[PDB]
Design a protein around this ligand. Structure first.
Ligand SMILES: C[C@@H]1CCO[C@H]2Cn3cc(C(=O)NCc4ccc(F)cc4F)c(=O)c(O)c3C(=O)N12
Ligand SMILES: C[C@@H]1CCO[C@H]2Cn3cc(C(=O)NCc4ccc(F)cc4F)c(=O)c(O)c3C(=O)N12
Ligand SMILES: [Mg+2]
Ligand SMILES: [Mg+2]
Ligand SMILES: [Mg+2]
Ligand SMILES: [Mg+2]
Ligand SMILES: [Zn+2]
Ligand SMILES: [Zn+2]
Lengths: 242, 70, 47, 261, 261, 47, 70, 242
DNA sequence: CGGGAAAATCTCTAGCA
DNA sequence: ACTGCTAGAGATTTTCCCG
DNA sequence: CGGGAAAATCTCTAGCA
DNA sequence: ACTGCTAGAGATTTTCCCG
């Protein structure tokens, strides 16, 4: 508390995201989110791309996490709807898959894949994928000598790409990047859930009119009144539901 | 600089066990994380817990609840 | 020294005494008839 | 306490009386009766009443096979989080286990796998797979399923879920994947009120973040401490207590009798 | 709380999410999420975590068969005392069980016998034997060995003792009788630090003595009490508390609001 | 009223709902499909 | 006459259990013994225990120890 | 305490047993035993009788508890040492058998019976048995029509005799009598055990010479000094082992 | 500070076969 | 030298909320 | 009243198959 | 309308004993 004005000034002078203001000034994320949302002027993690490539006369189904570059690939006996549905069901069970982007191939348009997406609650919409396939083929060629079957080589290539290839802004691997992105998405979901929980109530302070509730503390209550954020003690404030 | 990093590392929560009690001890505070030991603070008590007995998380619900704030 | 009596592996018959080479949190390493064995402390008694 | 001891010893050799009976019937103190019982091999038939604790490090997975409707299901669980992976395999063999394990190692940072001594887990093929993927192999004490207690428990959980959703799938493999999904994302509880998926994400991200933060602190902060001996290395000072390390030994001491240089 | 409920119900029908997951993911209060879970038959797969308690009245014996070296051992235990009787029988049949039971009933006051639903215990011959000896028969819930816990435990104990003395006898029947002796007279502990034989003697003698004393007291003492309802019968008065019986109901009341006539 | 779901006898499959006729210290008596059964409370859930 | 018999009946020791706890409660004093209930005194507390949960003994070792004497 | 003089006077005027003095005046059994044993002027439970009877060309082994009249009878295939040894082992396991009296028959003198008596710690020494056999035959004849085999009738007769035949001083059954006798024997054994435990210590009171220890209470110590029993406060007395 | 509902923590079980 | 655990069903104990 | 050994009570497990 | 228990291995807590 007693830092909301500093947060507003810093937002005006930098237009920083709510995370920066919450961390630097040590404010609850709800308060910072309300502050950033108020200024009108200043106003992905679950998306995957599916494709089928061919190598050595065998079909490899490849899934790319667009935001991270994290790859999951499998050799499938045939390029059929059943195999794609099973692969997608596995992926959904192992990662929070929200949307899948395909290329209108018959297997992806099959009713089996539609059923799998419906049960898993996944949305389907018909150059990252091609470059990814190119790099996967490169790694498979590099490691083809250490294996005996194509599927083992494909899994080794997935391992190398996801955890042994480092490069980018911070020099992290795809696995670390996807873990970080999913963690951030969980943070965002929790923030939204608590905003939903809190926004259903109203606060009367000192008696003034109804005001939006933002945060409840041990001995302090942070509220918003006509685009103005204020701190009031609990004894002086009454919280109700309407 | 150093203080910010120390506060961040102290934002993490630790659930641990003692050598003879199967129930997991509640969310203690993290002070130091080593290769094989974690030094935690649990209600003004400083304990050294072996790595294999500690689960270290940044509980995101509580982080978004603002509980870390004074 | 220590005498250890233990229930080896799916055999309901208790054995021992065996020398206690090592004692851990939930297991012990013993030597019986010049054979080293690893036994859960649930399945061992040390005297 | 000599003739009583002799009579008690003969009585025990015949009947193996417990120490209370001998103490009562031969005017013996409890210590000597207990010594009589303890010196008899034939009366040592019970291990100490306790349980150990399995390793729960962030990099350990527990693997096991289970059976359902005449088919083999390979199951892995991330111990720290309870996050499971599973799949039907045609045969309970080392090749299928190694393929499963290479898959797992390419999707999560598997440092160690802990399993029972089933033939598939002890095969040379799985050993080669672990060697390639940089995975350490730990085997529990034979015929001690408690050593794999986590994954065994998950075998019970997965099967349960499989029974809840068996009528939504024609094939058992689809039901297995459905149950994996349900467990990893649709069941909340335990540490943090998380689901297993969010819990594993949090655990791994926390591992990376705390590692980086501690590395930065060590790079910036460096000091030596003398306490009630050698020049130990400080780890955290505050609240009237100082934590130090001296020859791979971490000790917490009060602020008194501790100088920081 | 009506929009979230429908989505939670659909999500549950597909996945059978537990109440925590639904409360988290659909902004639901715990009560409504729990109601959703409770209204689903497919999610009721666990009984309440507790144990009952077996009858321990002075007249109840628990009987069971056990097997050793390809031979059948019939075992009875006096529940209140832990006193056991046992013998090898050639066949696990109703005739031998009834002979054993008639023998037991002629040596101790057996009022009731509690057994599992093995065919020998449900035979008409054993029923006739119990009818002749004035013995009430109780059968546990089928495939619930816990209902016979005591005797089951004693089976384990008996076998253990047999293993301790099996080398002192050539035949298994002799070893069984040796083990019965050892348990009944050479093992002390439990209530009163007794052996099982001493404990059963004490239990039976106390039963007779207390019955006679209470009968004499009732013959001598007779009074009526009014508390708060009717002329209850006093049982024990003193120490600022009165115990009364009214309509076959026993009530303990403070000395206040209680008049003795 | 009460709904009771129970595990009957050596059958790992849970059944119910059944009416709760009686509740004891460690067991219950229920009626499922016009059939009266006695189940340990360990093997039953009442709602 | 009556007092002697009452004292004798109160010399007996009772070990009992509560409806939900499996461990046996220590040697309470016996006050009244009925067909289906026993009224006992356990540290100035008067409890009615069902017959099927009570083991009533005259611990002979204690009786010879003189512990029943004032 | 403060009743030793009354106990001594009662013993002098009646020479009653220690149980009566302990119960009437509420004294520890050790003190009453010492008092009764002091006067020189005033200075079985485990005994069994074995026999073999014959009926309908079958051998019935009968054991009688002499003190109580309680019978244990079986039908044995042959009058052999092995059968007798097994019967004796069973009896010893079920009751505290200390001695058995036999009629010098070959089975009772067999090495098998000697081994059984040695393992069970039973002593063998070679008009109650005959009368009990007659009563057993009478009961068997009375109930022979209710059974089909002789062994069942024998067990029914044992039941009737032990628990359904009442008669004597108090109209008690044989089972009740044997239970009472064995309870009294346990009482006696415990009294002897505590006397043995206590006799190994000496007491110095107020400092006088060593005195025999009889009872150590919570606030007093009862001792004997030259055929005189006295009570001493705990503080004024010291107990040692010689 | 006083009660009551709610939330949290505690106790205990089967099944993993 | 390695090691029972998991998640659900009730029970009981704090904790929050309006006077 | 102060410590230490002993006794008692408490906690927990396998096996009953 | 019926029902886990037993006995042993350590752990921990009272209780007694001499100053
Ligand atoms: C041939 C492989 C290798 C050698 O051992 C066998 C037998 N076995 C037995 C069980 C088992 O008895 N589970 C029940 C159980 C009991 C107690 C507990 F704490 C946990 C539990 F799971 C397994 O689970 C299991 O996987 C195996 C197995 O794989 N094998
Ligand atoms: C054919 C009869 C009639 C129908 O039931 C079967 C099977 N049964 C099984 C066990 C058993 O599983 N014991 C293990 C156990 C497990 C838990 C516990 F608390 C106590 C325990 F003894 C028995 O003891 C037993 O006697 C029988 C038996 O006789 N029968
Ligand atoms: Mg296995
Ligand atoms: Mg297994
Ligand atoms: Mg049975
Ligand atoms: Mg059985
Ligand atoms: Zn022995
Ligand atoms: Zn459901």
């Amino acid at each position: 508390l007693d830092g909301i004005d500093k947060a507003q000034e810093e937002h005006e002078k930098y237009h920083s995201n709510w995370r920066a203001m919450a961390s630097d000034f040590n404010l609850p994320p709800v308060v910072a989110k309300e502050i950033v949302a108020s200024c009108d002027k200043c106003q992905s993690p679950g998306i995957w791309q599916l494709d089928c490539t061919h190598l050595e006369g065998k079909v490899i189904l490849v899934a790319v996490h667009v935001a991270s570059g994290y790859i999951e690939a499998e050799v499938i006996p045939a390029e059929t709807g059943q195999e794609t549905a099973y692969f997608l069901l596995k992926l959904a069970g192992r990662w929070p898959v929200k949307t899948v982007h395909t290329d209108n191939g018959s297997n992806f348009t099959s009713t089996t894949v539609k059923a799998a997406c419906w049960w898993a609650g996944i949305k389907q919409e018909f150059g990252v994928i091609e470059s990814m396939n190119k790099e996967l083929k490169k790694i498979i060629g590099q490691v083809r000598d250490q294996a005996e079957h194509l599927k083992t080589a494909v899994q080794m290539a997935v391992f190398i790409h996801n955890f042994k290839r480092k490069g980018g802004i911070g020099g992290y691997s795809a696995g670390e990047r996807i873990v970080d992105i999913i963690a951030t998405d969980i943070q965002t979901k929790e923030l939204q859930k608590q905003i939903t929980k809190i926004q259903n109530f109203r606060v009367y302070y000192r008696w003034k009119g109804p005001a939006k509730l933002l945060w409840k503390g041990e001995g302090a209550v942070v509220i918003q009144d006509n685009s103005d954020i204020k701190v009031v003690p609990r004894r002086k404030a009454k919280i109700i539901r309407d | 600089e150093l203080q910010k990093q120390i506060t961040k590392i102290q934002n993490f929560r630790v659930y641990y066990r003692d050598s003879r009690d199967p129930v997991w001890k509640g969310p203690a505070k993290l002070l130091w994380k080593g290769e094989g030991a974690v030094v935690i603070q649990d209600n003004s008590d400083i304990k050294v817990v072996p790595r294999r007995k500690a689960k270290i998380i940044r509980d995101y619900g509580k982080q978004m609840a603002g509980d870390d704030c004074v | 020294n220590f005498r250890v009596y233990y229930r080896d592996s799916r055999d309901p018959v208790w054995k021992g005494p065996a020398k206690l080479l090592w004692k851990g949190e939930g297991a012990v390493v013993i030597q019986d008839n010049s054979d080293i064995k690893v036994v859960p402390r649930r399945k061992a008694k040390i005297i």
